[PDB]
Amino acid sequence: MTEYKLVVVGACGVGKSALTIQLIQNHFVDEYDPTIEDSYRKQVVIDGETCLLDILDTAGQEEYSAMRDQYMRTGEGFLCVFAINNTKSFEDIHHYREQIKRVKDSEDVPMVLVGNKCDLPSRTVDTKQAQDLARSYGIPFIETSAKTRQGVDDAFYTLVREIRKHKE
Ligand SMILES: *CCC(=O)N1CCN(c2nc(NCCC(=O)N(C)C)nc3cc(-c4cc(O)cc5ccccc45)c(Cl)cc23)CC1
Ligand SMILES: Nc1nc2c(ncn2[C@@H]2O[C@H](COP(=O)(O)OP(=O)(O)O)[C@@H](O)[C@H]2O)c(=O)[nH]1
Ligand SMILES: [Mg+2]
């Protein structure tokens, strides 16, 4: 079966680890060590086709370094996560998109924009703001809550669909 290398990126504390652990283990982690970067494998059925997901949950801060850049080029799709109560993390999406474009030779890289923590009432990044940014990039936007699990599988599966569309 096909294996998809997915890379979860975004600012510190947006929910990268919580999203990933909800996908893999189906529980919510409150204090997953912010410095720990690990990969997880999971077999899933998407649109009736079984595949293997190979998911990197990023945590390191280093950039513009040959080794990390070479590794990130191997990512086939990127889950670009911000938190809807963290304006800075939304603004950082530009930086993450630029890093993906910098390291990937391809001009069209599978990406999904994820606005996480949608269970919270204090929302400083509007749905429309994020939808407009996703429309500018031409990529899907998904609102998620790792806490309640809303949209978690949909975000990852949407990214796989974006890779399948790119490879075809
Ligand atoms: C809690 C700690 C945590 O989760 N993280 C992960 C994200 N981190 C991170 N920080 C930065 N800082 C640069 C300052 C800046 O201007 N902004 C907007 C944050 N840079 C990161 C870069 C990358 C990254 C690096 C390379 O080399 C390639 C590449 C390709 C595609 C996507 C990202 C990258 C990563 Cl993975 C995380 C970065 C802070 C700690
Ligand atoms: N309310 C809420 N809290 C979340 C959500 N996702 C993550 N968190 C919390 O925000 C903090 C940072 O999450 P984490 O996944 O460790 O962030 P990372 O640095 O991006 O890996 C932790 O306390 C999580 O429990 C969410 O969807 N809703
Ligand atoms: Mg983490």
Curated annotation (Swiss-Prot):
<dbReference type="GO" id="GO:0043524">
    <property type="term" value="P:negative regulation of neuron apoptotic process"/>
</dbReference>
<dbReference type="GO" id="GO:0060509">
    <property type="term" value="P:type I pneumocyte differentiation"/>
</dbReference>
<dbReference type="GO" id="GO:0035900">
    <property type="term" value="P:response to isolation stress"/>
</dbReference>
<comment type="subunit">
    <text>Interacts with PHLPP. Interacts (active GTP-bound form preferentially) with RGS14. Interacts (when farnesylated) with PDE6D; this promotes dissociation from the cell membrane. Interacts with SOS1. Interacts (when farnesylated) with GPR31. Interacts with RAP1GDS1. Interacts (active GTP-bound form) with both SHOC2 and PP1c (all isoforms) to form a tertiary complex; SHOC2 and PP1c preferably bind M-Ras/MRAS, but they also bind K-Ras/KRAS, N-Ras/NRAS and H-Ras/HRAS. Interacts (GTP-bound form) with MAPKAP1/SIN1; inhibiting K-Ras/KRAS activity.</text>
</comment>
<dbReference type="GO" id="GO:0051146">
    <property type="term" value="P:striated muscle cell differentiation"/>
</dbReference>
<keyword id="KW-0547">Nucleotide-binding</keyword>
<keyword id="KW-1017">Isopeptide bond</keyword>
<keyword id="KW-0963">Cytoplasm</keyword>
<keyword id="KW-0325">Glycoprotein</keyword>
<dbReference type="GO" id="GO:0010467">
    <property type="term" value="P:gene expression"/>
</dbReference>
<dbReference type="GO" id="GO:0003924">
    <property type="term" value="F:GTPase activity"/>
</dbReference>
<keyword id="KW-0472">Membrane</keyword>
<dbReference type="GO" id="GO:0005789">
    <property type="term" value="C:endoplasmic reticulum membrane"/>
</dbReference>
<dbReference type="GO" id="GO:0005741">
    <property type="term" value="C:mitochondrial outer membrane"/>
</dbReference>
<feature type="modified residue" description="N6-acetyllysine">
    <location>
        <position position="104"/>
    </location>
</feature>
<dbReference type="GO" id="GO:0043495">
    <property type="term" value="F:protein-membrane adaptor activity"/>
</dbReference>
<dbReference type="GO" id="GO:0030275">
    <property type="term" value="F:LRR domain binding"/>
</dbReference>
<dbReference type="GO" id="GO:0051450">
    <property type="term" value="P:myoblast proliferation"/>
</dbReference>
<dbReference type="GO" id="GO:0005737">
    <property type="term" value="C:cytoplasm"/>
</dbReference>
<keyword id="KW-0636">Prenylation</keyword>
<dbReference type="InterPro" id="IPR020849">
    <property type="entry name" value="Small_GTPase_Ras-type"/>
</dbReference>
<comment type="function">
    <text>Ras proteins bind GDP/GTP and possess intrinsic GTPase activity. Plays an important role in the regulation of cell proliferation. Plays a role in promoting oncogenic events by inducing transcriptional silencing of tumor suppressor genes (TSGs) in colorectal cancer (CRC) cells in a ZNF304-dependent manner.</text>
</comment>
<dbReference type="GO" id="GO:0051385">
    <property type="term" value="P:response to mineralocorticoid"/>
</dbReference>
<dbReference type="InterPro" id="IPR001806">
    <property type="entry name" value="Small_GTPase"/>
</dbReference>
<dbReference type="GO" id="GO:0016020">
    <property type="term" value="C:membrane"/>
</dbReference>
<keyword id="KW-0038">Ectodermal dysplasia</keyword>
<dbReference type="GO" id="GO:0000165">
    <property type="term" value="P:MAPK cascade"/>
</dbReference>
<dbReference type="GO" id="GO:0060038">
    <property type="term" value="P:cardiac muscle cell proliferation"/>
</dbReference>
<dbReference type="GO" id="GO:0060252">
    <property type="term" value="P:positive regulation of glial cell proliferation"/>
</dbReference>
<dbReference type="GO" id="GO:0048169">
    <property type="term" value="P:regulation of long-term neuronal synaptic plasticity"/>
</dbReference>
<keyword id="KW-0449">Lipoprotein</keyword>
<dbReference type="GO" id="GO:0051384">
    <property type="term" value="P:response to glucocorticoid"/>
</dbReference>
<keyword id="KW-0007">Acetylation</keyword>
<dbReference type="GO" id="GO:0019221">
    <property type="term" value="P:cytokine-mediated signaling pathway"/>
</dbReference>
<dbReference type="GO" id="GO:0051402">
    <property type="term" value="P:neuron apoptotic process"/>
</dbReference>
<dbReference type="GO" id="GO:0030036">
    <property type="term" value="P:actin cytoskeleton organization"/>
</dbReference>
<dbReference type="GO" id="GO:0008542">
    <property type="term" value="P:visual learning"/>
</dbReference>
<comment type="similarity">
    <text>Belongs to the small GTPase superfamily. Ras family.</text>
</comment>
<dbReference type="GO" id="GO:0005829">
    <property type="term" value="C:cytosol"/>
</dbReference>
<dbReference type="GO" id="GO:0030857">
    <property type="term" value="P:negative regulation of epithelial cell differentiation"/>
</dbReference>
<dbReference type="GO" id="GO:0048873">
    <property type="term" value="P:homeostasis of number of cells within a tissue"/>
</dbReference>
<dbReference type="GO" id="GO:0042802">
    <property type="term" value="F:identical protein binding"/>
</dbReference>
